[PDB]
Amino acid sequence: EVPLPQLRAYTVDASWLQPMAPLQIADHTWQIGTEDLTALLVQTPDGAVLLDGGMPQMASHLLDNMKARGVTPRDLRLILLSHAHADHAGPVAELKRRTGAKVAANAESAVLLARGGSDDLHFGDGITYPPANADRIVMDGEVITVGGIVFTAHFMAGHTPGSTAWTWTDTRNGKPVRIAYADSLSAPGYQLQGNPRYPHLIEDYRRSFATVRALPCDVLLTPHPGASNWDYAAGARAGAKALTCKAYADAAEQKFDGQLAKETAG
Amino acid sequence: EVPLPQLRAYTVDASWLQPMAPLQIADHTWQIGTEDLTALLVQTPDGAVLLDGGMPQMASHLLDNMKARGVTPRDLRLILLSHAHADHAGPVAELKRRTGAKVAANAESAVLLARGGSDDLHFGDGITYPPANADRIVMDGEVITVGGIVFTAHFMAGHTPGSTAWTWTDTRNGKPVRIAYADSLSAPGYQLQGNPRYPHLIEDYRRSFATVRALPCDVLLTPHPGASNWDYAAGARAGAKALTCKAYADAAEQKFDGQLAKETAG
Amino acid sequence: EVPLPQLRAYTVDASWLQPMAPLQIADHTWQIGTEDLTALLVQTPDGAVLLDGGMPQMASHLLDNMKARGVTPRDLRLILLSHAHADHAGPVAELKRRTGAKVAANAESAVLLARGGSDDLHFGDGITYPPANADRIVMDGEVITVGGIVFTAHFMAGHTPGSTAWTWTDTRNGKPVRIAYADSLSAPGYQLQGNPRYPHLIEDYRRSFATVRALPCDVLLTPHPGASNWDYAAGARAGAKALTCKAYADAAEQKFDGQLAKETAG
Amino acid sequence: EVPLPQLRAYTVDASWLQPMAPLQIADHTWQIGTEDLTALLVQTPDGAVLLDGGMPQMASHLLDNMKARGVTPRDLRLILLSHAHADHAGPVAELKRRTGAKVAANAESAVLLARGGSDDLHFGDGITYPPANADRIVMDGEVITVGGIVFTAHFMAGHTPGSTAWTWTDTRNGKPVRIAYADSLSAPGYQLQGNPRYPHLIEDYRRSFATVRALPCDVLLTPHPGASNWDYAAGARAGAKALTCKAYADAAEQKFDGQLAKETAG
Ligand SMILES: C[C@@H](O)[C@@H](C(=O)O)[C@@H]1N=C(C(=O)O)[C@@H]([C@H]2CCCO2)S1
Ligand SMILES: C[C@@H](O)[C@@H](C(=O)O)[C@@H]1N=C(C(=O)O)[C@@H]([C@H]2CCCO2)S1
Ligand SMILES: C[C@@H](O)[C@@H](C(=O)O)[C@@H]1N=C(C(=O)O)[C@@H]([C@H]2CCCO2)S1
Ligand SMILES: C[C@@H](O)[C@@H](C(=O)O)[C@@H]1N=C(C(=O)O)[C@@H]([C@H]2CCCO2)S1
Ligand SMILES: [Zn+2]
Ligand SMILES: [Zn+2]
Ligand SMILES: [Zn+2]
Ligand SMILES: [Zn+2]
Ligand SMILES: [Zn+2]
Ligand SMILES: [Zn+2]
Ligand SMILES: [Zn+2]
Ligand SMILES: [Zn+2]
Ligand SMILES: [Zn+2]
Ligand SMILES: [Zn+2]
Ligand SMILES: [Zn+2]
Ligand SMILES: [Zn+2]
């Protein structure tokens, strides 16, 4: 009669998988992912930090761009994550096997990462990736220092329970630049109200809008660059149109309020 | 010359290790731990639930009291935890090996449980126990239903990041009894202010006082019975002097404020 | 230019995904998987045992067939595995979430299961599935007893390092039937000689042929029924043509020797 | 009446905890543990390797001796283990937190390490330590190369299921020196015959005697130096009396045969 369906691969728009050469953000910060997925390399005298890696199949491209930047596999010391979904943490397990890198994440992100994104609160097992273990668990507001660059965690639960913004200060033209890598504030296909797997979802999102609003934020970057109005293919104008953290938070709250209203009506 | 010190066992007052027979709290809820450590057995038509197990060496005593209550190892379905320290989650790994029980806990409690309490934010490796894995991760406000009894999680971070109050409604003399098993609100030897491993410690405690204040709470129990003024050795008057959740929260906040002041002066 | 390739789903022949009603093997043993993937239900007075579950998408079908057999989710006590690949252990994580079942496996199978089949010695990350934790680690020759039925583990490393045969005695027409569930002895696309990830691969396979040869084996079953010449769609003649364990081992060794010769020439 | 007993710390002879300065074994290999517990530092141009760390409380001493040798925490790349008991793998978790080091171990050692030595086949929970995760799983005969030094794993199951000998070639006075770090072959208090948790214990020990016999072995070292007749306190004559691998294997088999006979009589 009728067999069970085949497994369906997690497929994405081609631009999410389009390799790009390293794009400099500030003196020591580079976008090294693809056109439409962020993966940030921060280079220090004492080794390199990677914030996100994009999709699972991006590992070799990431290592190629690191090499181009002067970063060997031994030189990658630390991987940080916005959140532990397949399109942002996808290649973490493989990067750990192929480099010196250790992962630091909050408890929520660590337990989702360790199950490869399976049993997702909203997606079930539809969007899985190779599991990885965290080496260090961070608390809200905790700092991690690499080669003199200080990264601060700001929890902003919602898109996932463990969603995190990471902030650090780089330089450019001799001046300090406070970079805010703010996580996703979307809720794609989520049941927002009365969700038994996430009862306080709405409150957490609202607190997260306020957290993002208030971040130290000369420059905002986001895991999907379009959410902060970056265009990584636009070269010297890639960041010209970028949103402030205040504007990003406001746009995400407006969208969220619309989704709530549509869910009540739907 | 001078060898490194021997490992120091986690030792406790004798009353914490003094076995007691099952003490009935309500129609289906029993204290089955020791005189000075709580371990709550909730019996349903559909299997039994255990909330905490006390110290690591209490596993066999717990199983003996379960048998006395009509609960075989196969009948224990679920273990819930106040928090994942050695004096409350100690025997969880062994109970999982010896019974049908699965563990449900929040992400913070799950990652501390999986490392056997090692790398504690405050105690280091001084207070470890056999590690165990959680089978289900719960979110704040999530419910779990066993044999018709509904348990609700209320996160109350502070004593540990994953500290949780568990609430359920039992009966007694035909009437409903709203039981609140509220976690510890102590901070024994903790650095409260400017703690790099827990930057928002003070805020979390203050929110946790408010959470405990507001719990549905005809009857309060606590992992250390003395914190809620229970005397498990007093038989028919064991619970007579018990605090309300409001009074427990207020006393813990008063103590916490004193500790803050002493830390500033110390 | 050219994006990175999309992720490729693990796809299989339709017959591997074709549901079938429970097929009785002996008094208490049933095939409950699909036409071309084995999943064995063994029913005891003291709960049920499942040996393999097939592909990840088979979980609900398995639970439907268990219900048909009188086995509720609470009644499933134990999951055993031939080996921890996606086409045999696929639905284990979900079954653990949805039933009372605990997993017993050897250390090799446990560490592959816990990484969802990623970083496979031969397949890399091409064939992954939701990760699951083992509850009990078994040693070679160890027995596990459920409701009076005694299961014995026989390690037969090769297809995976943790490949295992499981044996037990059922009954049929008042007589004992020694059932041998022997794991795969294939090496699909494997580098056999000088493999840096499995240096003693050839020796392990040869020992495994001898192990399978000698199993207590009135009736042989295999994870892919065609390997033991079962036809689960043939009803009352499904097992008529089944191989002996001796014949299965001999055929697998003949095939393996051919593959070795072809690899030397290739 | 009578409380349950206090937890009993894992205590050891003082000499096992007596710090010593680094003792050179060959051009790039040093003993850096205590008088009576081995911890081997192998220094390469490309970072350092540690084989065992001794007891849990030795972490800081190990890092002090590494510093004395020119090895900063960032420089420690790899930790290898003889076996995952508290007196040899004790400080691994803490070393991972405090250094760049990643752990490579076989599956058996990895699952015992991840449970901090709890649920030991012979010791139960009497001898536990902080749990740690392996970063790489090795197979029998697999090699790992650091800064040009090639380490080969030789499984020698018995003392634990995951017991391993590690071999590598160093130099001394311009000549190659084949170093064999052979694991323990003792069975302290073990039930050898008919052990339900280790049915093939005797066969594994006998195969392990043969494995040790045949190792490439200009110089033998062992986790307890006295087992190979090393005296780390004897300075320039520390290794003068050391056994060959053949003699070590023979002495261990003689002892094992005596223990078998005594167990039959006991
Ligand atoms: C698995 C899903 O989380 C992802 C997907 O659809 O593939 C995207 N992630 C997003 C994020 O915000 O991380 C949402 C955004 C990206 C552009 C459209 O909405 S949708
Ligand atoms: C490891 C420590 O957390 C425990 C200990 O000292 O053994 C106690 N736990 C307490 C709790 O509140 O859980 C504190 C209370 C109990 C009575 C004195 O303060 S102290
Ligand atoms: C991921 C692979 O392991 C599986 C696959 O190709 O999908 C099959 N498993 C087999 C086994 O023996 O488990 C091999 C057999 C089945 C029929 C052809 O060879 S191939
Ligand atoms: C937990 C136990 O494994 C250890 C102990 O007793 O503390 C020792 N380990 C040994 C080994 O061989 O690793 C045995 C040896 C050392 C000297 C006496 O027998 S005894
Ligand atoms: Zn610079
Ligand atoms: Zn996402
Ligand atoms: Zn996304
Ligand atoms: Zn009742
Ligand atoms: Zn505590
Ligand atoms: Zn306590
Ligand atoms: Zn029958
Ligand atoms: Zn397979
Ligand atoms: Zn297969
Ligand atoms: Zn040299
Ligand atoms: Zn040992
Ligand atoms: Zn030892």
mmCIF file with all atom_site columns, N, CA, C and O in Angstrom, chain B residues 46-80:
data_model
loop_
_atom_site.group_PDB
_atom_site.id
_atom_site.type_symbol
_atom_site.label_atom_id
_atom_site.label_alt_id
_atom_site.label_comp_id
_atom_site.label_asym_id
_atom_site.label_entity_id
_atom_site.label_seq_id
_atom_site.pdbx_PDB_ins_code
_atom_site.Cartn_x
_atom_site.Cartn_y
_atom_site.Cartn_z
_atom_site.occupancy
_atom_site.B_iso_or_equiv
_atom_site.pdbx_formal_charge
_atom_site.auth_seq_id
_atom_site.auth_comp_id
_atom_site.auth_asym_id
_atom_site.auth_atom_id
_atom_site.pdbx_PDB_model_num
ATOM 1   N N  . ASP B 1 46 ? -1.428 4.832  38.846 1.00 0.00 ? 46 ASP B N  1
ATOM 2   C CA . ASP B 1 46 ? -0.602 4.636  37.662 1.00 0.00 ? 46 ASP B CA 1
ATOM 3   C C  . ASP B 1 46 ? 0.887  4.663  37.966 1.00 0.00 ? 46 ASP B C  1
ATOM 4   O O  . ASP B 1 46 ? 1.679  4.961  37.070 1.00 0.00 ? 46 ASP B O  1
ATOM 5   N N  . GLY B 1 47 ? 1.285  4.370  39.193 1.00 0.00 ? 47 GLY B N  1
ATOM 6   C CA . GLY B 1 47 ? 2.684  4.382  39.561 1.00 0.00 ? 47 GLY B CA 1
ATOM 7   C C  . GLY B 1 47 ? 2.998  5.499  40.537 1.00 0.00 ? 47 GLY B C  1
ATOM 8   O O  . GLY B 1 47 ? 2.179  6.371  40.834 1.00 0.00 ? 47 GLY B O  1
ATOM 9   N N  . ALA B 1 48 ? 4.219  5.448  41.046 1.00 0.00 ? 48 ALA B N  1
ATOM 10  C CA . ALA B 1 48 ? 4.627  6.342  42.111 1.00 0.00 ? 48 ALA B CA 1
ATOM 11  C C  . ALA B 1 48 ? 5.631  7.372  41.599 1.00 0.00 ? 48 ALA B C  1
ATOM 12  O O  . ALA B 1 48 ? 6.377  7.134  40.643 1.00 0.00 ? 48 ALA B O  1
ATOM 13  N N  . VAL B 1 49 ? 5.631  8.519  42.263 1.00 0.00 ? 49 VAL B N  1
ATOM 14  C CA . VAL B 1 49 ? 6.551  9.625  42.013 1.00 0.00 ? 49 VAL B CA 1
ATOM 15  C C  . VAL B 1 49 ? 7.384  9.839  43.272 1.00 0.00 ? 49 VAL B C  1
ATOM 16  O O  . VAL B 1 49 ? 6.859  9.807  44.392 1.00 0.00 ? 49 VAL B O  1
ATOM 17  N N  . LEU B 1 50 ? 8.675  10.082 43.089 1.00 0.00 ? 50 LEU B N  1
ATOM 18  C CA . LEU B 1 50 ? 9.569  10.436 44.180 1.00 0.00 ? 50 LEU B CA 1
ATOM 19  C C  . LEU B 1 50 ? 10.089 11.844 43.946 1.00 0.00 ? 50 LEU B C  1
ATOM 20  O O  . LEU B 1 50 ? 10.588 12.148 42.856 1.00 0.00 ? 50 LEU B O  1
ATOM 21  N N  . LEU B 1 51 ? 9.966  12.705 44.960 1.00 0.00 ? 51 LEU B N  1
ATOM 22  C CA . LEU B 1 51 ? 10.533 14.046 44.923 1.00 0.00 ? 51 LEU B CA 1
ATOM 23  C C  . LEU B 1 51 ? 11.677 14.094 45.921 1.00 0.00 ? 51 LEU B C  1
ATOM 24  O O  . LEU B 1 51 ? 11.444 14.062 47.135 1.00 0.00 ? 51 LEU B O  1
ATOM 25  N N  . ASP B 1 52 ? 12.905 14.168 45.384 1.00 0.00 ? 52 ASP B N  1
ATOM 26  C CA . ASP B 1 52 ? 14.178 14.048 46.099 1.00 0.00 ? 52 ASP B CA 1
ATOM 27  C C  . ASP B 1 52 ? 14.434 12.668 46.710 1.00 0.00 ? 52 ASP B C  1
ATOM 28  O O  . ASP B 1 52 ? 13.505 11.908 47.012 1.00 0.00 ? 52 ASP B O  1
ATOM 29  N N  . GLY B 1 53 ? 15.709 12.356 46.926 1.00 0.00 ? 53 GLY B N  1
ATOM 30  C CA . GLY B 1 53 ? 16.079 11.150 47.625 1.00 0.00 ? 53 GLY B CA 1
ATOM 31  C C  . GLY B 1 53 ? 17.040 11.341 48.779 1.00 0.00 ? 53 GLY B C  1
ATOM 32  O O  . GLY B 1 53 ? 17.406 10.370 49.441 1.00 0.00 ? 53 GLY B O  1
ATOM 33  N N  . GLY B 1 54 ? 17.448 12.576 49.054 1.00 0.00 ? 54 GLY B N  1
ATOM 34  C CA . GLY B 1 54 ? 18.386 12.812 50.133 1.00 0.00 ? 54 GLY B CA 1
ATOM 35  C C  . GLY B 1 54 ? 19.822 12.508 49.735 1.00 0.00 ? 54 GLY B C  1
ATOM 36  O O  . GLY B 1 54 ? 20.243 12.837 48.616 1.00 0.00 ? 54 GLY B O  1
ATOM 37  N N  . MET B 1 55 ? 20.575 11.891 50.646 1.00 0.00 ? 55 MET B N  1
ATOM 38  C CA . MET B 1 55 ? 21.999 11.584 50.496 1.00 0.00 ? 55 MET B CA 1
ATOM 39  C C  . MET B 1 55 ? 22.234 10.324 49.656 1.00 0.00 ? 55 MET B C  1
ATOM 40  O O  . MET B 1 55 ? 21.350 9.477  49.531 1.00 0.00 ? 55 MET B O  1
ATOM 41  N N  . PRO B 1 56 ? 23.453 10.155 49.109 1.00 0.00 ? 56 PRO B N  1
ATOM 42  C CA . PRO B 1 56 ? 23.723 8.992  48.237 1.00 0.00 ? 56 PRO B CA 1
ATOM 43  C C  . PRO B 1 56 ? 23.483 7.665  48.917 1.00 0.00 ? 56 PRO B C  1
ATOM 44  O O  . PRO B 1 56 ? 23.014 6.713  48.271 1.00 0.00 ? 56 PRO B O  1
ATOM 45  N N  . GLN B 1 57 ? 23.750 7.578  50.217 1.00 0.00 ? 57 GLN B N  1
ATOM 46  C CA . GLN B 1 57 ? 23.637 6.294  50.887 1.00 0.00 ? 57 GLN B CA 1
ATOM 47  C C  . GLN B 1 57 ? 22.201 5.953  51.290 1.00 0.00 ? 57 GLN B C  1
ATOM 48  O O  . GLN B 1 57 ? 21.980 4.905  51.896 1.00 0.00 ? 57 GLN B O  1
ATOM 49  N N  . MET B 1 58 ? 21.207 6.771  50.919 1.00 0.00 ? 58 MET B N  1
ATOM 50  C CA . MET B 1 58 ? 19.825 6.507  51.300 1.00 0.00 ? 58 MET B CA 1
ATOM 51  C C  . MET B 1 58 ? 19.055 5.626  50.312 1.00 0.00 ? 58 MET B C  1
ATOM 52  O O  . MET B 1 58 ? 17.888 5.334  50.554 1.00 0.00 ? 58 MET B O  1
ATOM 53  N N  . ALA B 1 59 ? 19.667 5.157  49.223 1.00 0.00 ? 59 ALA B N  1
ATOM 54  C CA . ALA B 1 59 ? 18.886 4.485  48.188 1.00 0.00 ? 59 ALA B CA 1
ATOM 55  C C  . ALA B 1 59 ? 18.148 3.259  48.722 1.00 0.00 ? 59 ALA B C  1
ATOM 56  O O  . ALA B 1 59 ? 16.957 3.074  48.452 1.00 0.00 ? 59 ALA B O  1
ATOM 57  N N  . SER B 1 60 ? 18.848 2.382  49.447 1.00 0.00 ? 60 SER B N  1
ATOM 58  C CA . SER B 1 60 ? 18.214 1.146  49.904 1.00 0.00 ? 60 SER B CA 1
ATOM 59  C C  . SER B 1 60 ? 17.111 1.431  50.916 1.00 0.00 ? 60 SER B C  1
ATOM 60  O O  . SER B 1 60 ? 16.050 0.803  50.873 1.00 0.00 ? 60 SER B O  1
ATOM 61  N N  . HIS B 1 61 ? 17.350 2.360  51.838 1.00 0.00 ? 61 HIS B N  1
ATOM 62  C CA . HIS B 1 61 ? 16.298 2.763  52.764 1.00 0.00 ? 61 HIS B CA 1
ATOM 63  C C  . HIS B 1 61 ? 15.058 3.265  52.026 1.00 0.00 ? 61 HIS B C  1
ATOM 64  O O  . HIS B 1 61 ? 13.925 2.938  52.408 1.00 0.00 ? 61 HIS B O  1
ATOM 65  N N  . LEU B 1 62 ? 15.252 4.089  50.988 1.00 0.00 ? 62 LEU B N  1
ATOM 66  C CA . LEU B 1 62 ? 14.126 4.591  50.202 1.00 0.00 ? 62 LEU B CA 1
ATOM 67  C C  . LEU B 1 62 ? 13.338 3.446  49.578 1.00 0.00 ? 62 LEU B C  1
ATOM 68  O O  . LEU B 1 62 ? 12.100 3.451  49.596 1.00 0.00 ? 62 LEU B O  1
ATOM 69  N N  . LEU B 1 63 ? 14.041 2.469  49.004 1.00 0.00 ? 63 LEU B N  1
ATOM 70  C CA . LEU B 1 63 ? 13.374 1.329  48.396 1.00 0.00 ? 63 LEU B CA 1
ATOM 71  C C  . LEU B 1 63 ? 12.668 0.473  49.444 1.00 0.00 ? 63 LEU B C  1
ATOM 72  O O  . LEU B 1 63 ? 11.590 -0.070 49.179 1.00 0.00 ? 63 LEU B O  1
ATOM 73  N N  . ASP B 1 64 ? 13.245 0.357  50.645 1.00 0.00 ? 64 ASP B N  1
ATOM 74  C CA . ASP B 1 64 ? 12.562 -0.334 51.741 1.00 0.00 ? 64 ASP B CA 1
ATOM 75  C C  . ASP B 1 64 ? 11.271 0.370  52.125 1.00 0.00 ? 64 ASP B C  1
ATOM 76  O O  . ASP B 1 64 ? 10.249 -0.281 52.368 1.00 0.00 ? 64 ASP B O  1
ATOM 77  N N  . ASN B 1 65 ? 11.305 1.701  52.240 1.00 0.00 ? 65 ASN B N  1
ATOM 78  C CA . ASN B 1 65 ? 10.075 2.396  52.603 1.00 0.00 ? 65 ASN B CA 1
ATOM 79  C C  . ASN B 1 65 ? 9.064  2.335  51.469 1.00 0.00 ? 65 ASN B C  1
ATOM 80  O O  . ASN B 1 65 ? 7.864  2.231  51.722 1.00 0.00 ? 65 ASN B O  1
ATOM 81  N N  . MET B 1 66 ? 9.520  2.382  50.217 1.00 0.00 ? 66 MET B N  1
ATOM 82  C CA . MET B 1 66 ? 8.587  2.221  49.105 1.00 0.00 ? 66 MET B CA 1
ATOM 83  C C  . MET B 1 66 ? 7.886  0.874  49.175 1.00 0.00 ? 66 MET B C  1
ATOM 84  O O  . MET B 1 66 ? 6.663  0.793  49.005 1.00 0.00 ? 66 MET B O  1
ATOM 85  N N  . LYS B 1 67 ? 8.645  -0.198 49.418 1.00 0.00 ? 67 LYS B N  1
ATOM 86  C CA . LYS B 1 67 ? 8.051  -1.523 49.565 1.00 0.00 ? 67 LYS B CA 1
ATOM 87  C C  . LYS B 1 67 ? 7.002  -1.518 50.669 1.00 0.00 ? 67 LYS B C  1
ATOM 88  O O  . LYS B 1 67 ? 5.886  -2.015 50.484 1.00 0.00 ? 67 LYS B O  1
ATOM 89  N N  . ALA B 1 68 ? 7.351  -0.953 51.827 1.00 0.00 ? 68 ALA B N  1
ATOM 90  C CA . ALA B 1 68 ? 6.403  -0.844 52.932 1.00 0.00 ? 68 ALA B CA 1
ATOM 91  C C  . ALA B 1 68 ? 5.097  -0.181 52.508 1.00 0.00 ? 68 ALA B C  1
ATOM 92  O O  . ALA B 1 68 ? 4.033  -0.484 53.067 1.00 0.00 ? 68 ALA B O  1
ATOM 93  N N  . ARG B 1 69 ? 5.159  0.738  51.549 1.00 0.00 ? 69 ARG B N  1
ATOM 94  C CA . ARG B 1 69 ? 4.005  1.472  51.041 1.00 0.00 ? 69 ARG B CA 1
ATOM 95  C C  . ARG B 1 69 ? 3.287  0.762  49.901 1.00 0.00 ? 69 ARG B C  1
ATOM 96  O O  . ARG B 1 69 ? 2.292  1.293  49.395 1.00 0.00 ? 69 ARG B O  1
ATOM 97  N N  . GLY B 1 70 ? 3.780  -0.391 49.457 1.00 0.00 ? 70 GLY B N  1
ATOM 98  C CA . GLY B 1 70 ? 3.185  -1.099 48.343 1.00 0.00 ? 70 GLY B CA 1
ATOM 99  C C  . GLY B 1 70 ? 3.758  -0.749 46.988 1.00 0.00 ? 70 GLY B C  1
ATOM 100 O O  . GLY B 1 70 ? 3.122  -1.042 45.967 1.00 0.00 ? 70 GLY B O  1
ATOM 101 N N  . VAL B 1 71 ? 4.947  -0.153 46.942 1.00 0.00 ? 71 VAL B N  1
ATOM 102 C CA . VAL B 1 71 ? 5.557  0.325  45.707 1.00 0.00 ? 71 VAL B CA 1
ATOM 103 C C  . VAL B 1 71 ? 6.783  -0.542 45.454 1.00 0.00 ? 71 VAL B C  1
ATOM 104 O O  . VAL B 1 71 ? 7.776  -0.474 46.191 1.00 0.00 ? 71 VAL B O  1
ATOM 105 N N  . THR B 1 72 ? 6.702  -1.379 44.434 1.00 0.00 ? 72 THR B N  1
ATOM 106 C CA . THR B 1 72 ? 7.843  -2.153 43.985 1.00 0.00 ? 72 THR B CA 1
ATOM 107 C C  . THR B 1 72 ? 8.740  -1.281 43.126 1.00 0.00 ? 72 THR B C  1
ATOM 108 O O  . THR B 1 72 ? 8.348  -0.208 42.669 1.00 0.00 ? 72 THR B O  1
ATOM 109 N N  . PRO B 1 73 ? 9.949  -1.743 42.857 1.00 0.00 ? 73 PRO B N  1
ATOM 110 C CA . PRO B 1 73 ? 10.840 -0.985 41.963 1.00 0.00 ? 73 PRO B CA 1
ATOM 111 C C  . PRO B 1 73 ? 10.232 -0.688 40.594 1.00 0.00 ? 73 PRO B C  1
ATOM 112 O O  . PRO B 1 73 ? 10.427 0.407  40.051 1.00 0.00 ? 73 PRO B O  1
ATOM 113 N N  . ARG B 1 74 ? 9.490  -1.631 40.025 1.00 0.00 ? 74 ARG B N  1
ATOM 114 C CA . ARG B 1 74 ? 8.836  -1.393 38.743 1.00 0.00 ? 74 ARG B CA 1
ATOM 115 C C  . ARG B 1 74 ? 7.807  -0.274 38.824 1.00 0.00 ? 74 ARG B C  1
ATOM 116 O O  . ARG B 1 74 ? 7.539  0.378  37.806 1.00 0.00 ? 74 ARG B O  1
ATOM 117 N N  . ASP B 1 75 ? 7.240  -0.030 40.016 1.00 0.00 ? 75 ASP B N  1
ATOM 118 C CA . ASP B 1 75 ? 6.139  0.909  40.204 1.00 0.00 ? 75 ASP B CA 1
ATOM 119 C C  . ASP B 1 75 ? 6.600  2.363  40.281 1.00 0.00 ? 75 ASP B C  1
ATOM 120 O O  . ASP B 1 75 ? 5.770  3.270  40.138 1.00 0.00 ? 75 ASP B O  1
ATOM 121 N N  . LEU B 1 76 ? 7.879  2.609  40.553 1.00 0.00 ? 76 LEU B N  1
ATOM 122 C CA . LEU B 1 76 ? 8.398  3.970  40.624 1.00 0.00 ? 76 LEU B CA 1
ATOM 123 C C  . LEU B 1 76 ? 8.614  4.466  39.203 1.00 0.00 ? 76 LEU B C  1
ATOM 124 O O  . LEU B 1 76 ? 9.437  3.919  38.458 1.00 0.00 ? 76 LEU B O  1
ATOM 125 N N  . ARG B 1 77 ? 7.841  5.470  38.810 1.00 0.00 ? 77 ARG B N  1
ATOM 126 C CA . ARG B 1 77 ? 7.798  5.924  37.426 1.00 0.00 ? 77 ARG B CA 1
ATOM 127 C C  . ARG B 1 77 ? 8.608  7.186  37.185 1.00 0.00 ? 77 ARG B C  1
ATOM 128 O O  . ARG B 1 77 ? 9.105  7.392  36.075 1.00 0.00 ? 77 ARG B O  1
ATOM 129 N N  . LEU B 1 78 ? 8.742  8.039  38.194 1.00 0.00 ? 78 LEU B N  1
ATOM 130 C CA . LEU B 1 78 ? 9.203  9.396  37.965 1.00 0.00 ? 78 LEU B CA 1
ATOM 131 C C  . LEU B 1 78 ? 9.944  9.867  39.200 1.00 0.00 ? 78 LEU B C  1
ATOM 132 O O  . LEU B 1 78 ? 9.461  9.659  40.316 1.00 0.00 ? 78 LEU B O  1
ATOM 133 N N  . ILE B 1 79 ? 11.109 10.484 38.989 1.00 0.00 ? 79 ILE B N  1
ATOM 134 C CA . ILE B 1 79 ? 11.844 11.196 40.029 1.00 0.00 ? 79 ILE B CA 1
ATOM 135 C C  . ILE B 1 79 ? 11.905 12.661 39.636 1.00 0.00 ? 79 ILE B C  1
ATOM 136 O O  . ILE B 1 79 ? 12.277 12.996 38.498 1.00 0.00 ? 79 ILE B O  1
ATOM 137 N N  . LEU B 1 80 ? 11.497 13.528 40.578 1.00 0.00 ? 80 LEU B N  1
ATOM 138 C CA . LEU B 1 80 ? 11.576 14.979 40.481 1.00 0.00 ? 80 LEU B CA 1
ATOM 139 C C  . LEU B 1 80 ? 12.547 15.470 41.542 1.00 0.00 ? 80 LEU B C  1
ATOM 140 O O  . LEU B 1 80 ? 12.732 14.808 42.560 1.00 0.00 ? 80 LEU B O  1
#
